[PDB]
Amino acid sequence: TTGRIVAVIGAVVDVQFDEGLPPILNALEVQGRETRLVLEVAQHLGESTVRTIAMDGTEGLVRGQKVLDSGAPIRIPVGPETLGRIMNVIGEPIDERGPIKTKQFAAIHAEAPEFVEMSVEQEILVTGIKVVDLLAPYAKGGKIGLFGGAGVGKTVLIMELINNVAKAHGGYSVFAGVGERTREGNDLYHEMIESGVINLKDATSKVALVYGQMNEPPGARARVALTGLTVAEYFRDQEGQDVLLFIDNIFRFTQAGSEVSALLGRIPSAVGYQPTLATDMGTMQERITTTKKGSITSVQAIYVPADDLTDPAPATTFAHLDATTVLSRAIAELGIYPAVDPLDSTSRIMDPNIVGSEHYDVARGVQKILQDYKSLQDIIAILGMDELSEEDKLTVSRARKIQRFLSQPFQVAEVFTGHLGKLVPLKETIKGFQQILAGEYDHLPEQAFYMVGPIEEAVAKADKLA
Amino acid sequence: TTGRIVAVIGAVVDVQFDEGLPPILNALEVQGRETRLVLEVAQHLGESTVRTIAMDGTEGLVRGQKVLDSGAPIRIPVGPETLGRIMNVIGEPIDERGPIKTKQFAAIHAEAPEFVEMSVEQEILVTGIKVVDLLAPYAKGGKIGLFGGAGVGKTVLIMELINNVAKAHGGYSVFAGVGERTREGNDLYHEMIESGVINLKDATSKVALVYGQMNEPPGARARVALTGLTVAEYFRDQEGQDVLLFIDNIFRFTQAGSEVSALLGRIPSAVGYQPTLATDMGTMQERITTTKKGSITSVQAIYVPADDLTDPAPATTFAHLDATTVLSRAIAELGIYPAVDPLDSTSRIMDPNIVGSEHYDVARGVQKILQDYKSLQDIIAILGMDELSEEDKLTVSRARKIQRFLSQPFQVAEVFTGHLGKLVPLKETIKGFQQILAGEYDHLPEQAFYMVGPIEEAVAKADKLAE
Amino acid sequence: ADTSVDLEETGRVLSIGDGIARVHGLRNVQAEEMVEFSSGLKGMSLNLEPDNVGVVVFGNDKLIKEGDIVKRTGAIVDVPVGEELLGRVVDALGNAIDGKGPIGSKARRRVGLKAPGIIPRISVREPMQTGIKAVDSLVPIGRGQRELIIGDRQTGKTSIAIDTIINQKRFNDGTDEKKKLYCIYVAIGQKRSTVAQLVKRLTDADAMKYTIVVSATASDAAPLQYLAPYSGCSMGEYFRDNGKHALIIYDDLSKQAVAYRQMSLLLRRPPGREAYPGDVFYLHSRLLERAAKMNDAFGGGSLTALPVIETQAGDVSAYIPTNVISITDGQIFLETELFYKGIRPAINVGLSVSRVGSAAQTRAMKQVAGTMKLELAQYREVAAFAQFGSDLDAATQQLLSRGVRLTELLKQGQYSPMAIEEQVAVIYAGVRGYLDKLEPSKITKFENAFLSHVISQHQALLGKIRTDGKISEESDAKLKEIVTNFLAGFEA
Amino acid sequence: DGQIFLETELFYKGIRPAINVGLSVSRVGSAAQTRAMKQVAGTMKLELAQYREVAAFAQFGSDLDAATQQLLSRGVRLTELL
Numbered sequence A: 001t002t003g004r005i006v007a008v009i010g011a012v013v014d015v016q017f018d019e020g021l022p023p024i025l026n027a028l029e030v031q032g033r034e035t036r037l038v039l040e041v042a043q044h045l046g047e048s049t050v051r052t053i054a055m056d057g058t059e060g061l062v063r064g065q066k067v068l069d070s071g072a073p074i075r076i077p078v079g080p081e082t083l084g085r086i087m088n089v090i091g092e093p094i095d096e097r098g099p100i101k102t103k104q105f106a107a108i109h110a111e112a113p114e115f116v117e118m119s120v121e122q123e124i125l126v127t128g129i130k131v132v133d134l135l136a137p138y139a140k141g142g143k144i145g146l147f148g149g150a151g152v153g154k155t156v157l158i159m160e161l162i163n164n165v166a167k168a169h170g171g172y173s174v175f176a177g178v179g180e181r182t183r184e185g186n187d188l189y190h191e192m193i194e195s196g197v198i199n200l201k202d203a204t205s206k207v208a209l210v211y212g213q214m215n216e217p218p219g220a221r222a223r224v225a226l227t228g229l230t231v232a233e234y235f236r237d238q239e240g241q242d243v244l245l246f247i248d249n250i251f252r253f254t255q256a257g258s259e260v261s262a263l264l265g266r267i268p269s270a271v272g273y274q275p276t277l278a279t280d281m282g283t284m285q286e287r288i289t290t291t292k293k294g295s296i297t298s299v300q301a302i303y304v305p306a307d308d309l310t311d312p313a314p315a316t317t318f319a320h321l322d323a324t325t326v327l328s329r330a331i332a333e334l335g336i337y338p339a340v341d342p343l344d345s346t347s348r349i350m351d352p353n354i355v356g357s358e359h360y361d362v363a364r365g366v367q368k369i370l371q372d373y374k375s376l377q378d379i380i381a382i383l384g385m386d387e388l389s390e391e392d393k394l395t396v397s398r399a400r401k402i403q404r405f406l407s408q409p410f411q412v413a414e415v416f417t418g419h420l421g422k423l424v425p426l427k428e429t430i431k432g433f434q435q436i437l438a439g440e441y442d443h444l445p446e447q448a449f450y451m452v453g454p455i456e457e458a459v460a461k462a463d464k465l466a
Numbered sequence B: 001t002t003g004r005i006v007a008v009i010g011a012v013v014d015v016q017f018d019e020g021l022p023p024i025l026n027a028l029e030v031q032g033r034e035t036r037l038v039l040e041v042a043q044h045l046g047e048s049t050v051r052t053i054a055m056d057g058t059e060g061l062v063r064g065q066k067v068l069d070s071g072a073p074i075r076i077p078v079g080p081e082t083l084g085r086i087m088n089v090i091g092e093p094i095d096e097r098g099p100i101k102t103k104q105f106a107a108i109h110a111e112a113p114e115f116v117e118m119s120v121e122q123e124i125l126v127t128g129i130k131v132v133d134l135l136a137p138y139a140k141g142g143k144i145g146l147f148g149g150a151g152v153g154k155t156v157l158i159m160e161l162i163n164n165v166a167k168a169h170g171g172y173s174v175f176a177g178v179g180e181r182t183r184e185g186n187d188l189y190h191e192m193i194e195s196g197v198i199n200l201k202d203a204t205s206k207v208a209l210v211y212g213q214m215n216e217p218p219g220a221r222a223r224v225a226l227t228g229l230t231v232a233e234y235f236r237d238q239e240g241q242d243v244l245l246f247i248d249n250i251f252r253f254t255q256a257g258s259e260v261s262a263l264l265g266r267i268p269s270a271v272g273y274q275p276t277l278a279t280d281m282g283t284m285q286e287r288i289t290t291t292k293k294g295s296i297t298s299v300q301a302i303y304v305p306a307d308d309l310t311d312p313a314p315a316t317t318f319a320h321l322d323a324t325t326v327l328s329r330a331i332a333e334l335g336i337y338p339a340v341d342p343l344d345s346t347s348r349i350m351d352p353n354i355v356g357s358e359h360y361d362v363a364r365g366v367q368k369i370l371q372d373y374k375s376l377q378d379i380i381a382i383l384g385m386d387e388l389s390e391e392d393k394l395t396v397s398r399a400r401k402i403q404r405f406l407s408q409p410f411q412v413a414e415v416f417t418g419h420l421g422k423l424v425p426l427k428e429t430i431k432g433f434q435q436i437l438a439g440e441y442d443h444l445p446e447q448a449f450y451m452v453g454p455i456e457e458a459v460a461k462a463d464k465l466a467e
Numbered sequence C: 001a002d003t004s005v006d007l008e009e010t011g012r013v014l015s016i017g018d019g020i021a022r023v024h025g026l027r028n029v030q031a032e033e034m035v036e037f038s039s040g041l042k043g044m045s046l047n048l049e050p051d052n053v054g055v056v057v058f059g060n061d062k063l064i065k066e067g068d069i070v071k072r073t074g075a076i077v078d079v080p081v082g083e084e085l086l087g088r089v090v091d092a093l094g095n096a097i098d099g100k101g102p103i104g105s106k107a108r109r110r111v112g113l114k115a116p117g118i119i120p121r122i123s124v125r126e127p128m129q130t131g132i133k134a135v136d137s138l139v140p141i142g143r144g145q146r147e148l149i150i151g152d153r154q155t156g157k158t159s160i161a162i163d164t165i166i167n168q169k170r171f172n173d174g175t176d177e178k179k180k181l182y183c184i185y186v187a188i189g190q191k192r193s194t195v196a197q198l199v200k201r202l203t204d205a206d207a208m209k210y211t212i213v214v215s216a217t218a219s220d221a222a223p224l225q226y227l228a229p230y231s232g233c234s235m236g237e238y239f240r241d242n243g244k245h246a247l248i249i250y251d252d253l254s255k256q257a258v259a260y261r262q263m264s265l266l267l268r269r270p271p272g273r274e275a276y277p278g279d280v281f282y283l284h285s286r287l288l289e290r291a292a293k294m295n296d297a298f299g300g301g302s303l304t305a306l307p308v309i310e311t312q313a314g315d316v317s318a319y320i321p322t323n324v325i326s327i328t329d330g331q332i333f334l335e336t337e338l339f340y341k342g343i344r345p346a347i348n349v350g351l352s353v354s355r356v357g358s359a360a361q362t363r364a365m366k367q368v369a370g371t372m373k374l375e376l377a378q379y380r381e382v383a384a385f386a387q388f389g390s391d392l393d394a395a396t397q398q399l400l401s402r403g404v405r406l407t408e409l410l411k412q413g414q415y416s417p418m419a420i421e422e423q424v425a426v427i428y429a430g431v432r433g434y435l436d437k438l439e440p441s442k443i444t445k446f447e448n449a450f451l452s453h454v455i456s457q458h459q460a461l462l463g464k465i466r467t468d469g470k471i472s473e474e475s476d477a478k479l480k481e482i483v484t485n486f487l488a489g490f491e492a
Numbered sequence D: 001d002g003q004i005f006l007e008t009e010l011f012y013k014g015i016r017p018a019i020n021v022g023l024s025v026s027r028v029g030s031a032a033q034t035r036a037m038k039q040v041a042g043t044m045k046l047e048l049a050q051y052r053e054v055a056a057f058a059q060f061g062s063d064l065d066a067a068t069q070q071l072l073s074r075g076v077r078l079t080e081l082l
């Protein structure tokens, strides 16, 4: 049907329909504008009025302008031809590469999987990267917190994860940029084409890009994380894949939703956040789980404010986080890539009951041997290297060979590095580290384990010349 | 035109006009009252009603009571005649010496001097106070701000500056009490009559006084600052000459704006302040300036609420100044008066191209050693003194002597200090700290430096403190 | 006929106060559309409501009374734009306020335009030189980038921007046209005397000729201070969209945030943290994304942004600062301690960061910057034991001596920006160890004498570093011979 | 015209009245005293304020010149007297 603009206040618009009203969350098309404008129904104010939140600039609006109900929520293209495409919150292709011709369109809102459709199985999504799979394993259909931004190759780690899931599990990925800086959007775009994941020619693309840029109103920043989730939801249920969902960054999704609740006029909760914070997080984070058909596993980049972990934003996010991946400057400056902190990254599935009996003792052994190394660091610098006992000399030399074997060259980075990329299978990693702990390579040098795939390529490298 | 009071709440009185409606800022006269009650139109509320702020008590006000529109905003007496006279918010002489017999009446709501009217010339105004003249000296024709919490010496400091500058000042001066003590004003009235700045017999008066102290209702304490500057405004523009404006306290302007802000119908900003805090201050402070037409040396005592500088009111004020002088309770706590913070005072003229490269480097060096000591304070407090090397703890004993030589017995604080007041020349101050930094006085104890004038006295006090 | 009132295109003031006019009628007004009151004043329709329109007054609200006729004149809120503005001091809307008559402006641009998309942009790689060693080597800025100046009051925030403007004279008087940079300084909520002190400091540098000064001072009304950043932005975009280069400095965004907040609170929009409306992040996000580097497809021009944020007690976790930190590509943190301790510009090497960084600085600077980044990093870890370390190993004792001397090199006075080639030379001396034997206090005088010499006698060498864009093995040896023998003679 | 501040630490430590010599001030000052009180209290307040500072700084074991020993001895006695 049709409705008229009764009120325009900032990014909040009110529309009066005569007859039937659009249910809450139905998209509204404002007619006669230059581009497309979407208004999302948030409330029913009574007297046949609705309160809507815009996804684009509300300048040039006339009171009385005809607004069209789309009869459904914000519907977006879903299907294989959304891969290698930059999407925005309302489905529109923003890569100037011609309209996305998908058979199906799906609404960005939808209820979380029923209790019956849940997966009672806890499984591990093997990433191919050693540091991850051994020490901080990703839960298949779980949620992972990525700490630390760029300057350590965040973008790379993401791309390699996209490559390796598409490789090992035959599952596509979706990048949802919440509050994407337009410079960083452009920069991330070409970085994905130059490395191989986005293919501008054929159909071999592995990612779908959705951009909620910063220069877009709070409505667009608060809902784009759904527009990305819905493109990912197609590949879970319709093609039965183990999907991968990137949100960067999750805090700007929380701040996006705080702005909306602040705009509608809701009394703010603690620390200035929205009263709906718990649910505002729940109604989205509960769509990301393992179903009967497939699974979506989400990597989320987190910003903690005032480095305060008790701050409600990270506190509400942590209730949903199954594993963490800390990208650190310190480890990156030593030369270990990926720049993952082996002791700082923790996982819920680090349990003999979930991964297995072997996986657990090998991971913990590696965890202990690196803590011991740190525990002897002051004794190393200020005592005299040659005065450690046999068991203290040995664990030091063994520990150094462990953190080097964490290092792994990346496929995505063949264009830069020039060296061959590696996908290390799960059991290859477990046994590889177990042997170094057992001392089976006490004779091999340190430089042997650096930037190698499995343990085989390390012993072969140990030969070199002499 | 005639209006009827339709509502009275606090100092906010709504009035309704049947015919011709009076605009914003206009002064209204309340009919049938003992002492004159002026209302100031703040808003147009609709249905031919206006919201006003009363310049005095609204006790005894009857609903429906008649109010005449004076046709303009508050217009006050201006000219040489104002000198030696205490005007209140509305220019009615509260000194009990008859009417201010002036040729002109200027309005307390004026426009801020244009960008083109601005002057850029700047010279050092020597105060004779060691702390200011060394670290953040005052610009002649410049804007000077005196920050300070409750009971640290804003007033005592502003008083010394009047003695040290205004007395031997050739041109005219304008003091304006805004929201402080009525008692403080009385003392200064008599202490400017005794000295001879205000002559009761003849018209050789150099000072014009305006007062709206913490006795008056908010509306008044919100406008009396404008009454003081408009006095200055004439002397600057219509007589060209150097003016010495002294305001105490200018924070009271913002505070009185808040006392009514809610009743005007405002959503409170941060810290229960008015939302107009910025623009209210901008249209007021920009009128307090030196122009191509004339010079105004302004000194403004700024109150600090709950000892927090980040309090919106004093924090916004910072951007309006040429030289800021900040006071600490912690510095005053240690008996260091004046309690000027050496690391918090900033001047526009602290450029070696103005004050001299010797002046600059000494001051920068003075601060560095006090800054360095502040960093050591917490380390030595737990981990003893011995752990400092012979070149580290040498700075500690120096910094405490530099800290204490910054203390100065004021001529106004005779009643508090117990010492004769001191006035130190510019070059005597720079030589002072230069030698101590050089370490030429490392033999003398700290107490020799505490509360003295020139540096020779710090040696003198050591000798007496000996035997 | 009688009392008809054209409620469609006109109306009357229902209620005026606090720069907010509630107007009856105007049934055809668009949101954010300029209006005109009886008295000739302008205003904006920021609130469209069922029974009224809330208009923010562009000026003194005494002139507006109840029942004043409010007229639509189909106004497009746009500012004069183009090279005619360079050298002038215009107001928040483009009007001249420097008493030099009208501006011969021909092109005029809207203030409310959208930022460029993802596509027409190319990666930031061209250098933007501040002439400040500390910056260009540790927190490097490039064309199309956004970098935040952020510290407490009087920490040296404006000086960083100031020295950058003066630095451009070098490029703007030469022949290399690509490397030219046009300057736009926006004073938002400042006092007129400080804004006057500014333009003089730019005149004396002969920098004004290429500087557009957009000014909305504290006396200028709330909406005037709100548009002033965007009004400058449009002026900078002209150059950007026409293959040229422009640098804009919003001084400051904390003061525009206050000026916006007032209006919302008084238009009665919901208050949030620190009384800020929901769209104040959105106020700055759309302003600062407008800065970009265009590809050769779109002329290849660039606009470069420099926001200033004032923090209180160093709190960078305040709502507005938290906004702008994430908005931008990087920050430079200035601290009170560093200031009075001596380290000026008081740039905190630790916290300060640029994402573009490495790819923005010339291949010459790269050659000595990352080394300095690593060495000052290892210095700051041990910095606390600079005196309490008699019995430390000779390794950390070198890392302390290396750091203190580099810290002295990054020191700088105002108003003397350094060319990219002059920068690498004085940084080459300390980074390659050729100052590790010189007494700390003597470094600043050496830099002054050593720089005075290389310009005066080895013009070809510095020129080669500029030409080649890198320090070749030839130049490397040529620099080593000058430093070793000049330093030896210095200590004689 | 000034304030009298009292602390629990001073109260429990023995000092009664528990007046904080550093924080409290009097804005009328000596003008409110008899010329008999002024002859003995003319400089005492600023003296004890300087003593209270040097008391917590001298407890770090540093060898003290007799000039700062003199102020230490005087400050202990006058606090007991009040």
Ligand SMILES: Nc1ncnc2c1ncn2[C@@H]1O[C@H](COP(=O)(O)OP(=O)(O)NP(=O)(O)O)[C@@H](O)[C@H]1O
Binding pocket: B148, B149, B150, B151, B152, B153, B154, B155, B156, B157, B180, B249, B303, B337, B338, B408, B409, B410, B413, B416, B417, D001, D002, D025, D026, D027, D028, D029
């Ligand atoms: N130079 C000085 N020497 C000795 N005592 C001083 C000096 N300056 C201030 N004092 C003392 O400290 C007190 C505070 O001085 P005052 O000038 O009234 O501060 P203030 O900032 O105006 N307080 P307020 O306006 O109520 O917030 C006075 O009672 C003085 O006795």
Ligand SMILES: Nc1ncnc2c1ncn2[C@@H]1O[C@H](COP(=O)(O)OP(=O)(O)NP(=O)(O)O)[C@@H](O)[C@H]1O
Binding pocket: B318, B319, B347, B348, B350, B351, C152, C153, C154, C155, C156, C157, C158, C159, C160, C310, C344, C345, C346, C412, C413, C414
């Ligand atoms: N590199 C420097 N060396 C020496 N002095 C400096 C330097 N940078 C700034 N200053 C001085 O420090 C003062 C503050 O510098 P400024 O650039 O105006 O900081 P600011 O943050 O803009 N001050 P404000 O606008 O009041 O918050 C100025 O008066 C300068 O003289």
Ligand SMILES: [Mg+2]
Binding pocket: B154, B155, B180, B248, B249, B301
């Ligand atoms: Mg006072």
Ligand SMILES: [Mg+2]
Binding pocket: C157, C158, C251
């Ligand atoms: Mg500034």
